[PDB]
Structure formats: structure tokens, C-alpha cells
Amino acid sequence: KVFGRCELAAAMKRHGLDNYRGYSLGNWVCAAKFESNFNTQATNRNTDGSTDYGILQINSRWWCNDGRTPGSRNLCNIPCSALLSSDITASVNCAKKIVSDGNGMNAWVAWRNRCKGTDVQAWIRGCRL
Numbered sequence: 001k002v003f004g005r006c007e008l009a010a011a012m013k014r015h016g017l018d019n020y021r022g023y024s025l026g027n028w029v030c031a032a033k034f035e036s037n038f039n040t041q042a043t044n045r046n047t048d049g050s051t052d053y054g055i056l057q058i059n060s061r062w063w064c065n066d067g068r069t070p071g072s073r074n075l076c077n078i079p080c081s082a083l084l085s086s087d088i089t090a091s092v093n094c095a096k097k098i099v100s101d102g103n104g105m106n107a108w109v110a111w112r113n114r115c116k117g118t119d120v121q122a123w124i125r126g127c128r129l
């Protein structure tokens, strides 16, 4: 699924991500924008052989099991495929563990480089939430 901007905002709000660990909904939307362009089925191989999965590009080196990432962990206790669902529940739950790990949303490199410090509120401008 390719979410609309406000559609995704509403889904993230519905699943308790707005102001989770103090990150406003804008931040989650901006991150998903530059991670997946809103597309739940987004996958990208990393040069180290891990893969990033879904709207928030959760990585198999630590978070989810894909069975092909030697040495990795699965700290969200999910197959990475479950991060590709139309329903964002699994991604949202794992993103909550990721963002609580200590470095906040800086774990998402695209958030650091493209969202951090910006007028992230634009991402939810005009949305009925």
C-alpha cells in the first residue's frame, strides 16, 4: 500500500505514534516519506547484506528476521515480511522499540539528514486528525 500523507498521519495517530518518546506526528510522517515514500512494500538491501523493510525501513541486522542476514538479531520478534503489510501495526510496534533504544529518531538516518530540525509540522498541515 502507498499511503496518502494525511492517511498515514491518521494511521500513525491511531496506533499511538503521535508524540511517542516526544516525537510529534510530523516527525514520523517526514521519516516515512524519505524512508519509503509512504509505500508499505518498500525494501532496500544494505551493502552489509541486511535489508530494510517497509514504511519506516526497519532493518534486519537488529530488528526483524529475514533468514538471510548472518549474525543479525530479531529484537522485534517478527519476520521482516510482517513489516510490509498494508496494516502498519507491526511496523509501528517495532518502531516504538527502535525509538526507545537510546538515540531517538537518529536511528533513522534519513530522518536525521532530511527531517531533523525542519518544519516537520508541514507534514501534517491540513490533515484532520
Ligand SMILES: CNC(=O)/C=C(\C)OP(=O)(O)OC
Binding pocket: 035, 044, 052, 056, 057, 058, 059, 063, 098, 107, 108, 109, 110
Ligand atoms: C532505505 N533504508 C533505510 O534508510 C534504513 C534506515 C536507515 O534504517 P532504520 O530505518 O534506520 O532501520 C532500523
